[PDB]
């Protein structure tokens, strides 16, 4: 006699509570899925990761999670992933389809509207995650596995790599590296040490792939969330991209960026920062330009004067970036950073040569100056850089694919669009001006 | 210099992190409440029947199952854990809100026509909507210690403050007082059947025109957020009206079974004959044949073994709901149809029906044995109106995707009146009205 419910016996309670027992595992499976998505999002955007709090804007939601274990292969161990409101209040747990929707909105927004990921019949990562819920979950690493047994399996996997012509270059990341990360995240062994063991195992095979994987500064991986060429029918059709190679060495003895000498109406000189007092008029010029709206909309570095004063001094003191003032017929009109790719965020995004040089540019005195001048300056800088460093093979840039006037200026100057790349705050057209 | 892949831990670190973890329990409960709100809407807007005990349903690409612990007279059901099941019935996920919204969206967009506003490229999706609502202030809960006395007070005030005559908006009764009754019921404050009695008295007390409507129609206006060809999400949802069963309405009329119409002209119609002896007889064999040919099974989805159809036909013939018949055209037995009483049918929750309303499902077996289709439909509707003088209209519910059928019904004199959400499809409600 209950009418709005079921009349309850102990047998009823038994059936249902038995069912409630597997829910703990279900929640754990959702956690594992959301973590797999977050790792891919971090790798495919080349977002830097450190131990401790991680804070991220993914499409329409703010996402945050503690990085309890930072993995050298990106196999990070996370705390609870939470969605935050504008003030920083947790309003939700970031379950997998939620992450898939946020990532999809962000990725589709990063690429151009004409891109394949944005075609009407392309599907979305939400369809892909949805259609995958019944997939067999992979076995976990045995929590009690020995490090010796870990080396055993890893060598097995490295030798069994097709290691021949026709085989897939991304196989190293997909197989041996993935295993190393799961071993690391389980606490079985240290990943840096497992990578050394992997390195020697590759020296033992004088195959062509083996030598490549030991020497190139980046490695082939496959992206499932970021990339203009993505499709989900409803299954993901991944697209290739490049990631940093942990087996390739740290610092190199590459000199600082050279000071080119521009031809034509253009002039260029390094930025000067006085140790004494304010920092000088160059610090104020850049600071002024960087805080105007049309520049911060691209550079997003609208900082106080003293933060820019120390950024410039930090760059000048180092071997990475060289800040310069550009003149046109007597007037100081532009700021540039010339940088060595090898010491730059760009080094994780494409197979660079050791002397590769990049250019960031902000036109400050556009306000009453310039039309057609863009390609001209870019062309003058690119050629002068190749002239100043004969060991430099190419000059590169990474305008936002949405900055269509910038992309056009680079192409008209002679840069060619080599690929799209995923960066922490944008997708870029990788523009390459090659030496011939 | 001891922890490179992690942070060096002190008690203050543990304190910061565990404090933040205490709030996760409320976060999970908030997701649970959102998912339940979405499932209640999905069940209401698809008119899916709900009883206490296990509930199992297909939503787009996923199978969903949940225990119905509290079956609410206003659809404010109380659920156990909502799980996604694979083909064998093994749970593979907990159905969190954005998951449910994505399955419901895929299913709804699939239910409506490609030209529908819900399917435009510039339309949002329920996913955009749920996503954009996570930072909303969660709505106040019913105070668990509230009295039923206080429940009636607030309910009476709310019904009396309804706009009544000026301005209209009829979905206000379901959206206002009924929503409160369901929340009171689900919280255990009072019995919903009792709260509905109380609400009825307050509506008799004014006898305005809306109050009179709300006590007499067999359906009520409600507003849909997941199912409906005209839905849009401008991040925020733009609801569309639809009808739901009226709990305040008695019904239970002494409505007879369907009559046997008499077709003239080239047409003939007789009830199906089911032999007790052996196979079931030649009519059971005819329907079985037709229902398993490809062009019919693509719409009816009843390409069954002969033994199942013998028992289906006999079950219909024995009851008061549906009447299976064989239709001839100039001597050849060419079609099968069911005439059914709406008041005993799933259609009864979808529009304000009259007690004697009659419906038609039809399958043409002897296909082109072309153009004869609307003519048959027109003959049946008129003959049904002749056979039952108290019947107000003849209806049908072709799948909105079955446009050849919809067109044939319109050419016969039916009006495509609205789209309706049904358990396995959206249908175009075709109405052949007597006046
Ligand atoms: Mg009992
Ligand atoms: Mg410690």
UniProtKB/TrEMBL annotation, chain A:
GO molecular function: N-acyltransferase activity
GO biological processes: siderophore biosynthetic process
Family matches, as SUPFAM superfamilies: Acyl-CoA N-acyltransferases (Nat)
Top-level lineage group: Bacteria
Pathway assignment: Siderophore biosynthesis; mycobactin biosynthesis
Pfam family, one: Acetyltransf_8
Binding positions for acetyl-CoA 1 per the UniProt entry: 361, 363, 374-375, 403
Binding site for acetyl-CoA 2: 363, 372, 374-375, 406, 426
Cross-referenced PANTHER family: LYSINE N-ACYLTRANSFERASE C17G9.06C-RELATED
Entry function: Acyltransferase required for the direct transfer of medium- to long-chain fatty acyl moieties from a carrier protein (MbtL) on to the epsilon-amino group of lysine residue in the mycobactin core.
The protein's name in its UniProt record: Lysine N-acyltransferase MbtK
């Amino acid at each position: 006699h209950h009418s709005s419910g079921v009349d309850l016996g102990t047998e009823n309670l038994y059936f249902q509570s038995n069912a409630m027992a597997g829910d703990v595992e279900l929640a754990d499976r959702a956690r594992r899925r959301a973590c797999r998505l977050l790792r891919r999002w971090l790798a495919e955007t080349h977002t830097p990761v450190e131990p401790g709090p991680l804070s991220l804007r993914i499409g329409p939601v703010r996402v945050s999670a503690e990085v309890a274990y930072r993995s050298p292969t990106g196999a990070h161990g996370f705390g609870p992933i939470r969605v935050l409101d504008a003030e920083g209040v947790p309003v939700a747990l970031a379950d997998p389809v939620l992450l898939a929707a946020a990532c999809s909105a962000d990725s589709r927004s990063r690429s151009l509207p004409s891109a394949p990921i944005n075609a009407p019949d392309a599907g979305t990562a939400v369809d892909w995650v949805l259609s995958s819920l019944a997939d067999d979950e992979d076995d976990e690493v045995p929590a009690g596995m020995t490090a010796e047994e870990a080396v055993r399996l890893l060598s097995r996997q490295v030798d069994d790599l097709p290691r021949s012509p026709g085989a897939d270059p991304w196989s190293l990341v997909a197989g041996p590296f993935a295993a190393i990360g799961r071993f690391g995240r389980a606490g079985i062994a240290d990943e840096c040490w497992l990578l050394e063991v992997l390195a020697g195992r590759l020296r033992a095979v004088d195959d062509d792939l083996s030598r490549s994987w030991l020497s190139s500064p980046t490695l082939a991986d496959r992206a499932v969330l970021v990339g203009e060429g993505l499709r989900y029918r409803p299954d993901v059709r991944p697209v290739p991209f490049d990631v940093p190679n942990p087996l390739h060495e740290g610092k190199s003895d590459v000199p600082p960026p050279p000071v080119p000498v521009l031809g034509g109406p253009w002039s260029l000189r390094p930025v000067e920062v006085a140790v004494h007092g304010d920092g000088g008029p160059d610090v104020a010029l850049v600071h002024r330009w960087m805080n105007t709206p049309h520049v911060a909309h691209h550079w997003n570095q609208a900082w106080p004067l003293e933060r820019w004063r120390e950024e410039l001094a930090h760059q000048l003191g180092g071997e990475h970036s060289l800040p310069c003032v550009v003149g046109h017929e007597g007037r100081e009109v532009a700021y540039l950073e010339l940088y060595r790719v090898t010491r730059d965020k760009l080094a994780g995004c494409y197979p660079y040569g050791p002397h590769d040089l990049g250019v960031h540019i902000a036109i400050g005195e556009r306000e009453v100056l310039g039309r057609g001048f863009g390609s001209s300056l870019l062309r003058a800088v690119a050629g002068a850089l190749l002239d100043a460093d004969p060991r430099c093979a190419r000059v590169v840039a990474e305008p936002n694919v949405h900055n269509e006037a910038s992309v056009r200026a680079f192409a008209k100057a002679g840069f060619v669009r080599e690929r799209e790349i995923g960066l922490p705050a944008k997708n870029s057209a990788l523009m390459v001006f090659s030496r011939v």
